[PDB]
């Protein structure tokens, strides 16, 4: 299989290794109590939280706040990319990280246990629009104060980042959708179609990507609950028949077809290559 190296980033179970829709693939102890927290190694492009008044607002210190960190001194959240690089200008192992990894490491730098070295590290959202890193004080992603994770037009520049986001995600994680390409399975020297797919109608690539995300790996219904990256993470979008062909086994090659755009739950809902 000549596709092995190229198709490695689409082995979401191996490169991401956790839930996508709801990421709670690890546990951390904060002073005698275990908590669930995100642990996906890949960034989730376009993911945000919909509150049934926006989740990037700071946590309430009334009764209706958001998911983000409360105001701090010095203000470490929200913090711009340049603000972060300046903050870590003496740390050569951090100051030159890509914006997503840096945001992840910045969030993971904040220890809640002020008297001991705990392993709890907050998730984060990087907004490409403002170039701002938002540390999420609340790691919860769905509760149905009801809320749910989703891909949305409002969220297209958001990126959901766990503590485990690898510094080489650009090389090993998906981002762009593959235009004129179709996910397939390599068999006997030929790339065959995915034998069984679940067809969901979708008006455009965005809605297909949204659907895949809704059906993808989830660490919370509606260990034990951990998906470990297993799920309906991939989708072949036929732009002509407007079919989002969704499946749950990893693809191992590409098929040239001008009618198709290959997408994943981790991928950006718009960007193509």
């Amino acid at each position: 299989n000549p596709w092995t190296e190229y198709m490695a980033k689409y082995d979401i179970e191996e490169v991401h290794g956790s839930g996508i829709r709801v990421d709670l693939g690890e546990d951390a102890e904060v002073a005698g109590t275990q908590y669930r927290l995100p642990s996906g190694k890949c960034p989730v492009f376009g993911k945000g939280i919909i509150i049934e008044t926006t989740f990037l607002k700071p946590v309430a210190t009334l009764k209706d706040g958001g998911f983000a960190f409360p105001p701090t001194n010095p203000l470490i959240s929200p913090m711009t990319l340049n603000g972060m690089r300046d903050f870590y200008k003496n740390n050569e192992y951090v100051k030159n990280l890509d914006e997503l990894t840096l945001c992840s490491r910045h969030a993971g730098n904040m220890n809640p246990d002020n008297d001991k070295n705990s392993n709890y590290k907050y998730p984060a959202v990087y907004d490409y629009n403002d170039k701002k890193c938002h540390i999420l004080y609340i790691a919860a992603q769905e509760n149905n104060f009801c809320f749910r994770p989703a891909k949305d037009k409002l969220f297209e520049n958001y990126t959901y980042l766990s503590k485990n986001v690898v510094d080489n995600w650009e090389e090993v994680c998906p981002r762009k959708n593959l235009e004129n390409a179709k996910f397939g399975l390599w068999v006997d020297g030929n790339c065959e179609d995915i034998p069984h797919v679940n067809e969901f109608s979708a008006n455009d690539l965005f809605e297909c990507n949204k659907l895949v995300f809704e059906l993808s790996a989830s660490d919370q219904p509606k260990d034990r609950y951990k998906s470990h990256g297993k799920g309906y993470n991939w989708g072949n979008y036929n732009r002509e028949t407007q079919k989002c062909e969704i499946f749950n086994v990893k693809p191992t090659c590409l098929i040239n077809n001008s009618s198709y755009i290959a997408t994943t739950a981790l991928s950006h809902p718009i960007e193509v290559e």
């Binding site: 001194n73 010095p74 470490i76 740390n91 951090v94 993971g108 904040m110 220890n111 809640p112």
Partner: peptide, 13 residues
């Protein structure tokens, strides 16, 4: 309040 993990450590409230 939080404590930074990377050096040098500080309290951020």
């Amino acid at each position: 309040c939080w404590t930074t993990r990377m050096s040098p450590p500080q309290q951020i409230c």
